[PDB]
Amino acid sequence: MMQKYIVYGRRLPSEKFPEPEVFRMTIYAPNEIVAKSRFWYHLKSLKKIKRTHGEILDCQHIEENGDFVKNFGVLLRYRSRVGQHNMYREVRETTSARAMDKVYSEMAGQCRARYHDIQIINVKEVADEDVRREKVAMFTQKGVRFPHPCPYVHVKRAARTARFQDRAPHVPQ
Amino acid sequence: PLCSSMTIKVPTDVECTINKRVVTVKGKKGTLVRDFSHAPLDITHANDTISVAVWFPRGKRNALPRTICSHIENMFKGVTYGFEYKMRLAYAHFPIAATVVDNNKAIEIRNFMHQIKTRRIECLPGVTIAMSTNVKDELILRGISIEDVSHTAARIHESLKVPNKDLRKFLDGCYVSSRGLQEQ
Amino acid sequence: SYHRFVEAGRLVYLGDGPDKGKLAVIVDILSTAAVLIDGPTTGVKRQVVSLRWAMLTDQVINISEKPTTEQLKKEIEASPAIDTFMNSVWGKKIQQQRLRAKATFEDMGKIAKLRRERKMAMKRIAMS
Amino acid sequence: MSRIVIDCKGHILGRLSAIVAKELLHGHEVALVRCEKAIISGAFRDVKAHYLKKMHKRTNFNHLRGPFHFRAPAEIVRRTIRGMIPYKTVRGSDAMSRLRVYDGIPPCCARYKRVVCPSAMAYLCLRPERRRCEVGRVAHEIGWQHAADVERYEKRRLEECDKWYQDKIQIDKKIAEAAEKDAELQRINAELAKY
Amino acid sequence: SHRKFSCCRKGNLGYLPRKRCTRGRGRCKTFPPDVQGAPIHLTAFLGYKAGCTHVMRFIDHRGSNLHNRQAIDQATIIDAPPMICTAIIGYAKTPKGLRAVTTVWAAHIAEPAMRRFYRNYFHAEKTAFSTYMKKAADGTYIKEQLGRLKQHADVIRIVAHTQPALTPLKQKKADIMEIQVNGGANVAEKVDYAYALMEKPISIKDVFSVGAQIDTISITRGRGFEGVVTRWGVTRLPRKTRRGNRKVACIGAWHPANVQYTVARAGQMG
Amino acid sequence: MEEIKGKTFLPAIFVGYQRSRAKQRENVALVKVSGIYTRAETDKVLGRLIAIIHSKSGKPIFGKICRPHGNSGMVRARFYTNLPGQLMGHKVRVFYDNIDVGDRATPKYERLYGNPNATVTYE
RNA sequence: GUGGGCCCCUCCUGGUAAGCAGGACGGGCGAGGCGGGACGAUCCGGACGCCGGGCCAGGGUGCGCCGCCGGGGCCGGAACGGCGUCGGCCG
RNA sequence: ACCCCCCCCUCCGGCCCCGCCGCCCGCGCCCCAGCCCCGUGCCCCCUGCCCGAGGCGGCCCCCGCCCGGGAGGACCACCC
Ligand SMILES: [K+]
Ligand SMILES: [K+]
Ligand SMILES: [K+]
Ligand SMILES: [K+]
Ligand SMILES: [K+]
Ligand SMILES: [K+]
Ligand SMILES: [K+]
Ligand SMILES: [K+]
Ligand SMILES: [K+]
Ligand SMILES: [K+]
Ligand SMILES: [K+]
Ligand SMILES: [K+]
Ligand SMILES: [K+]
Ligand SMILES: [Mg+2]
Ligand SMILES: [Mg+2]
Ligand SMILES: [Mg+2]
Ligand SMILES: [Mg+2]
């Protein structure tokens, strides 16, 4: 659901500051309102400019091409019930937004960390030789084969409507 | 990884058969069967070798292939050479009196520590027991199935027990000295 | 001792989602839960599906490592595997699940009366 | 208004019970056969301890007023279904009166057509590492007196039906030769138009 | 609070309820277990308690203080005129316990057995076994129904009646009881043995042997409505209790607010 | 039943009234139609004439299918006269053909209180 | 008419503490129907003439009992212990 | 494993067989696997909607007291 936005913003100009500086950031957000809110979060904490004292110049939205599978390495920090920690993750997805959905679901599941708990430092494409995690680099190889990891699911799904039958169906593998 | 596997060679003397994780091996000493159909396994047989593989491990499933290979190796050693277990009757001042009965299919034990109660231990089918023909106070357990031979020997072991005493002083019983294959 | 495998060039029948009921060809393998699929001679856009929706066929279509839509299409048209899948028993059942798909209420009335005399003819035979 | 006859080999107790209860409340007659081959997930020992903890509960001042604990698999299944029916009303009592539950297949049902419910069978429901046990064995540990009898009767009847099927094979080869009734082909074509 | 001193409960709760017997007479609940290969024998008999006496016997125990000495023992005399075997029953072991196959009766039946079928004999008009005797005059019918029992029944019992015209007793109708045929080599040998017994007398000396052991089953002496001191054996209360010392003082705590089934009360004894 | 005798039908069941755990509305019946497992597949049986047989007198009540219920093929129906609780678990017939029953399939509040401003004419 | 109040949220005082006792802005029960929280004067929604249709808040959607599917992960209570399993940081 | 469950033992709705001797009702049989799943990923889908008797499975019916003794007993009941 994540979408890619670039946000440009600045401090509101004064007499000591004719033409203040300009700051841009890449934001991964469900939509524009959350994206600008998160931009103001970061530019408040880092450049000491609250929403009240500045203006957003633009929120560009970028669409991305797919059709090929890439490696994304994501460097982040999250918060738990004992402190704050730094983390690296790698995923194989088609676009950066989808890679970031995969990351967020995996954090929600294995760390129980929510969206406003997490700050993204870096997101970058990682070459095949350049990979560093098993569950990713496994699939970065030629001729990868495996038998279907869960073929009972089809049979159960059909049974959901074929409630009664005249034999126990097989599970083709 | 996606798989975890171990492979071993099939020695030329025996014949082997695999069927839905039912392994049957056959040579001169006998024919021996096991079911490994309580585990998920991919046992592949081709070109004179046996391979055991597990797809998508996540835990103690990575601990299976070495086990099903080791058990098969025993199923080869036992059908080619056979296992013998050599047990020593240890005592002090009350000689243990052991006879072989039921046509080598049972052992009978008297006078453990000068006791009236007598012990009868039957051999798990396929095993035989013989008094040593070489040195005294020694028994010989013989078979093609390591499981059966070892369970019989352990059965004599927990048959012969000394209650309500310091075991570090009162040391009597029938202990396994040699574990191994045969030597014709 | 399996015979069907997840791999490039495997044909699949899509069992769930917006493209339920169609065939496609696997082009790439994300992880143990997701694939990139593409069927351009059946009407499927290139996309990531969950393996929970893809029923593995027995056909593997020779392709290149990373193809494009039209060239993948030409590779498919070269291969004869879709034709064999339709000639097999399963594909025949699919074909008739497509003429029994588009039925109206009067049609159900018709088919129900007809099923009645199938039952009755089979009885008037099976009683010798 | 036929009857549905369900073979309880392979099925999970709670999932089958939920199905049977809804079907009964829709005014259906249902029998269930082979109740000692139904499955409860978990280790057999955990199942055992659970059923003995159930058995400990009785009315302190008179046990004839208390909960009654049945020891046979058929009545275990029946009590589990009552748990899902509102039986103290007239509607619930009618639903109960529409049920039947059996150990083995008895002759009163030996010529019915059986069906299954794969969405409640254990080979589709349980993960491969999960332990599982069958109801007959729990019943034998809690007090059921008739395990060996049901097995002897099952053995005999399976042999008898194995004989019957051999004649059934050829009897079908005659029935199937009825590819010669054009008053049937003239409508199998019509079936095909719609299928 | 806890009971301060330890003392067990009074009476055995495995003999509840203490109601009058409804069975008519002592009824044999269980038979001794059949041993495939054992020689054939009968297992049960029915007598009438006659009296008691005592005997002097030379004891040949071993390790006992009576090892080479004489003891005086109590003995009970039971009177057992020979019984008559009149029918054969077979049962089968089924998923629902013991179920019977059929009962085959004798061609000709005696007066005491006929009399047990009726309430008053001289008045009731007599149509018992009226069709059976006619049908079964020819023995072929009994042969075929025996054939059915042989074909498939798993246990065999014979149905035998006592004979009270050989007693000082007052009744005239018999007591009818099944004696199970145990042992043998198979079922069909037991059926043959039952056929050979059919319509004959049976003596107790051909069931039991001297020095063996038996179980005796009957109905105890009756005492009517009795209080707790005699019916349960609870302690009698002190002399200066206001309204009677033949009672249980407390029959329960406040909670639970009901009287428990483990508390002694008055009622039928014997 | 001398009018709908020859009319073939699709089978259904009257399972209950429309309710919550606190309240129950006897104006609307909840009905199960065979072969209808989806909310989207209710379009075809929507608006159709249906009927139930009231045991006493052996006569039918006529009604119409009005609306879907849930995600799973249940429907709502309104009958000529609201139904007694005794008739639960019984079968409902969905007619494949057309029958003119006139006004005899429509609910009582719509029959009267419907507000055409029906003036009582008095001839 | 009333001048016995009580509870919730935040902020406090005595006390080991208390469903203890004493104070503060705002709200509620008192004197507030209906649905939900199994069950409760006060919690979560919503505060009320008699009806017909529609939309839906709070809470939920195996059967009792009105209502569901798809996807990605994992599989009352303290100090202190765990070569259970999955994930990380630093060398 | 003095623990727990079953047997023995006590009560026991209901049911079964056998004695003297008619009614009704229904129409449907492979088995066994799921890390061989042996060629699957179906059938049924009209209980009247035009179905309707043998064989195989069910159902209903079927049997006195008073009177006097007692080994039984408040009255009753119980055994004769
Ligand atoms: K006390
Ligand atoms: K006391
Ligand atoms: K007392
Ligand atoms: K009490
Ligand atoms: K009591
Ligand atoms: K007492
Ligand atoms: K009393
Ligand atoms: K204090
Ligand atoms: K108010
Ligand atoms: K108020
Ligand atoms: K851990
Ligand atoms: K106990
Ligand atoms: K005992
Ligand atoms: Mg006084
Ligand atoms: Mg207070
Ligand atoms: Mg409530
Ligand atoms: Mg529901």
Q: Which residues of D touch C111 (CB under 8 A)?
A: 191, 194
Largest Cα separation within chain F, whole Å, is: 52
Half-sphere exposure of B60 (CA within 13 A, CB side): 3
Inter-residue contact D50 to D24 (CB < 8 Å): no
Q: What residues does E74 pair with on adjacent strands?
A: E54
Chains A and B touching, counted as 3 or more CB pairs less than 8 Å apart? yes
d(Cα B32, Cα B163) in Å, to the nearest integer?
Answer: 39
| Element (DSSP H or E) covering residue B93 | none
DSSP, collapsed to helix, strand or coil, labels residue B168 as coil
Cβ <8 Å between C55 and A154:
yes
The residues, any chain, with a CB within 8 Å of residue E77's CB and separated by 6 or more, are E50, E51, E52, E53
Half-sphere exposure of F74 (CA within 13 A, CB side): 13
D177/chain E closest Cα distance in angstroms = 41
d(Cα F62, Cα F52) in Å, to the nearest integer?
Answer: 7
Beta strands E41-42 and E176-182, pairing class: antiparallel
DSSP, collapsed to helix, strand or coil, labels residue C7 as coil
d(Cα E231, Cα E265) in Å, to the nearest integer?
Answer: 8
- Evaluate the CA torsion angle C36, C37, C40, C46 in order and state its sign: negative
Q: What residues does A119 pair with on adjacent strands?
A: A77
| Element (DSSP H or E) covering residue B125 | none
Half-sphere exposure of C54 (CA within 13 A, CB side): 31
Phi/psi of residue B148, each to 5°? -65, -45
Question: Left (φ > 0), alpha (ψ -120 to 50) or beta: where does A47 sit?
Answer: alpha
- Distances in Å between the alpha carbon of B94 and those of B163, B171, C104, E150, F83? 16, 12, 97, 61, 95
Inter-residue contact E36 to E177 (CB < 8 Å): no
Selection from E253, E254, E255, E236 nearest residue E245 by Cα: E236
Place of tokens 């027991």: B129
The residues, any chain, with a CB within 8 Å of residue A124's CB and separated by 6 or more, are A72, A73
d(Cα B115, Cα E187) in Å, to the nearest integer?
Answer: 47
- Evaluate the CA torsion angle D66, D72, D75, D81 in order and state its sign: positive
d(Cα E216, Cα C97) in Å, to the nearest integer?
Answer: 78
CB B106: neighbour CB atoms within 10 A?
A: 14
DSSP, collapsed to helix, strand or coil, labels residue D174 as helix
Selection from D32, D69, D42 nearest residue D144 by Cα: D69
Inter-residue contact B4 to B46 (CB < 8 Å): no
- Evaluate the CA torsion angle A124, A129, A134, A135 in order and state its sign: positive
DSSP, collapsed to helix, strand or coil, labels residue A89 as strand
- Distances in Å between the alpha carbon of D188 and those of C121, D182, D191, E222, F18? 11, 9, 5, 84, 43
C38/chain F closest Cα distance in angstroms = 28
> Could you tell me the end-to-end alpha-carbon distance of chain E, in angstroms, rounded to an integer?
37
Cis-peptide into E256, omega within 30 deg: yes
- C116: CA distance to ligand 1 center in Å? 80
B4-41 burial, b at 16+ Cβ within 10 Å, e below that, comes to bebeeebeeebebeeeebebebebeeeebebebeebeb
> Could you tell me the end-to-end alpha-carbon distance of chain D, in angstroms, rounded to an integer?
27
DSSP, collapsed to helix, strand or coil, labels residue B85 as strand
Selection from D145, C80, A59 nearest residue E95 by Cα: D145
Phi/psi of residue B16, each to 5°? -130, 150
The residues, any chain, with a CB within 8 Å of residue E31's CB and separated by 6 or more, are E43, E44, E180, E182
Chains A and C touching, counted as 3 or more CB pairs less than 8 Å apart? yes
Helices D44-55 and D135-142 pack at an angle, to 10 degrees, of 50
Phi/psi of residue F26, each to 5°? -85, 0
**Residue count (chain F):** 123
Chains C, D: CB pairs < 8 Å: 33
Inter-residue contact A89 to A104 (CB < 8 Å): no
Tokens at residue A29, please? 């957000």
Helices D90-97 and D13-25 pack at an angle, to 10 degrees, of 110
C10-40 burial, b at 16+ Cβ within 10 Å, e below that, comes to bbbbbbbeebeebbbbbbbbbbeebbbbbbb
In the chain, the amino acid numbered D194 is: K
d(Cα A58, Cα A79) in Å, to the nearest integer?
Answer: 30
Q: What residues does B175 pair with on adjacent strands?
A: B88
Q: Which ligand is nearest to the CA of E248?
A: 3
In the chain, the amino acid numbered C80 is: P
d(Cα C16, Cα C37) in Å, to the nearest integer?
Answer: 14
Inter-residue contact D87 to D93 (CB < 8 Å): yes
d(Cα B177, Cα B161) in Å, to the nearest integer?
Answer: 18
d(Cα A57, Cα A8) in Å, to the nearest integer?
Answer: 5
d(Cα D7, Cα D5) in Å, to the nearest integer?
Answer: 7
Q: What residues does E226 pair with on adjacent strands?
A: E267
Q: Check if C32 contacts B (Cβ < 8 Å).
A: yes
Give the DSSP letter string of A118-136: -EEEEEEE--STT---HHH
Inter-residue contact C34 to C17 (CB < 8 Å): no
CA of residue D53 to C1' of nucleotide G41, angstroms: 40
The residues, any chain, with a CB within 8 Å of residue E208's CB and separated by 6 or more, are E45, E214
Tokens at residue E197, please? 């017994």
- Distances in Å between the alpha carbon of A27 and those of A4, A8, B116, D19? 6, 11, 89, 49
CB E92: neighbour CB atoms within 10 A?
A: 13
Selection from B148, B160, D23, C12 nearest residue A151 by Cα: C12
- A78: CA distance to ligand 11 center in Å? 19
d(Cα D138, Cα D147) in Å, to the nearest integer?
Answer: 11
- E262: CA distance to ligand 5 center in Å? 5
Which experimental approach was used here? Answer: cryo-EM
Phi/psi of residue A78, each to 5°? -130, 180
Tokens at residue F6, please? 């020859």
Per-residue CB contacts under 7 A with strand H, chain E residues 126-145:
127-132
Walk across the sheet containing A119-125 and list its strands: A84-93, A70-79, A119-125
Place of tokens 């998920």: B40
Walk across the sheet containing C34-38 and list its strands: C47-50, C34-38, C22-31, C10-14, C54-60
Tokens at residue E172, please? 């005239």
> Could you tell me the end-to-end alpha-carbon distance of chain C, in angstroms, rounded to an integer?
46
Q: What residue spans of A70-148 are helical by DSSP H?
A: 96-110, 134-137
CA of residue B68 to C1' of nucleotide G72, angstroms: 35
For strand H, the positions having any atom within 7 A of a protein Cβ are: 4-13, 16-21, 28-51, 56-58, 65-66, 71-74, 77-80
**H and E: helices and strands count for chain F:** 1, 6
Selection from B118, B135, B109, B139 nearest residue B127 by Cα: B139
Query: D148: Cβ under 7 Å from strand H?
Result: no
d(Cα E114, Cα E108) in Å, to the nearest integer?
Answer: 10
Chains D and F touching, counted as 3 or more CB pairs less than 8 Å apart? yes
A165/chain D closest Cα distance in angstroms = 6
Selection from B64, B174, B163, B54 nearest residue B108 by Cα: B174
Cis-peptide into E17, omega within 30 deg: yes
Selection from E211, D1, E148, F8 nearest residue C112 by Cα: F8
Inter-residue contact B136 to B101 (CB < 8 Å): no
Tokens at residue D151, please? 């097995």
- Evaluate the CA torsion angle F71, F77, F82, F84 in order and state its sign: negative
Selection from E89, E85, E76 nearest residue E109 by Cα: E85
Query: E53: Cβ under 7 Å from strand H?
Result: no
Give the DSSP letter string of D16-78: HHHHHHHHHHTT-EEEEE-GGG-EEES-HHHHHHHHHHHHT---SS-GGGS-----SHHHHHH
Could you tell me where the beta strands, DSSP code E, fall in chain F?
A: 9-19, 24-33, 49-53, 60-69, 74-79, 91-95
Selection from D83, D72, D54 nearest residue D149 by Cα: D72
E171/chain D closest Cα distance in angstroms = 39
Inter-residue contact B56 to C33 (CB < 8 Å): no
Helices E140-151 and E187-197 pack at an angle, to 10 degrees, of 150
Q: Would you state the torsion angle of the CA atoms of residues D60, D65, D67, D71, taken in this order, to the nearest 10 degrees? A: 110
Inter-residue contact D42 to D69 (CB < 8 Å): no
Phi/psi of residue D144, each to 5°? -70, 130
Inter-residue contact A145 to C6 (CB < 8 Å): yes
Tokens at residue E91, please? 């049962």
Selection from D84, D87, D107, D105 nearest residue D97 by Cα: D87
d(Cα E103, Cα E115) in Å, to the nearest integer?
Answer: 19
Place of tokens 């007196």: D145
Cα–Cα–Cα angle for E143, E147, E149, nearest 5°? 120
The nucleotide lying nearest E104 (C-alpha to C1') is H18
d(Cα C66, Cα C49) in Å, to the nearest integer?
Answer: 18
Rg (CA), chain A: 22
Cβ <8 Å between D124 and A159:
yes
Tokens at residue D114, please? 């059986």
Cα–Cα–Cα angle for F105, F107, F112, nearest 5°? 115
Give the DSSP letter string of chain E: ---SS--PPSS-GGG---PPP-SSS------PPP-TTPPPEE-----EEEEEEEEEEE---SSSTTTTSEEEEEEEEEE-PPEEEEEEEEEEEETTEEEEEEEEE-SS--HHHHHTT-SSTTTS---SSHHHHHHTTSTHHHHHHHHHHHHS-SEEEEEEE--GGGSS-S--SPPEEEEEEE-SSSHHHHHHHHHHHTT-EE-GGGT--TT--------PPP-EEE-HHHHT-PPPPPTT-TT-SSS-S----SSSSS--TTS---EEE-
- Distances in Å between the alpha carbon of C66 and those of A67, B30, B153, C9, C28? 9, 56, 63, 11, 8
Q: Which residues of C touch D190 (CB under 8 A)?
A: 114
d(Cα D109, Cα D161) in Å, to the nearest integer?
Answer: 14
Query: D104: Cβ under 7 Å from strand H?
Result: no
CB D104: neighbour CB atoms within 10 A?
A: 21
Chains A, B: CB pairs < 8 Å: 11
Tokens at residue D68, please? 């009654």
In the chain, the amino acid numbered D174 is: K
Which 8-state DSSP code applies to residue D12? B
Q: Check if C101 contacts F (Cβ < 8 Å).
A: no
Selection from B171, B140, B167 nearest residue B153 by Cα: B140
DSSP, collapsed to helix, strand or coil, labels residue D119 as helix
Cα–Cα–Cα angle for B49, B51, B54, nearest 5°? 175
| Element (DSSP H or E) covering residue C59 | strand C54-60
CB F74: neighbour CB atoms within 10 A?
A: 17
DSSP, collapsed to helix, strand or coil, labels residue C51 as helix
Inter-residue contact D38 to D148 (CB < 8 Å): no
Selection from D13, D9, D75 nearest residue D37 by Cα: D9
- Distances in Å between the alpha carbon of A61 and those of A10, A26, A30, A83? 19, 10, 11, 34
Q: Which residues of B touch C32 (CB under 8 A)?
A: 2, 56
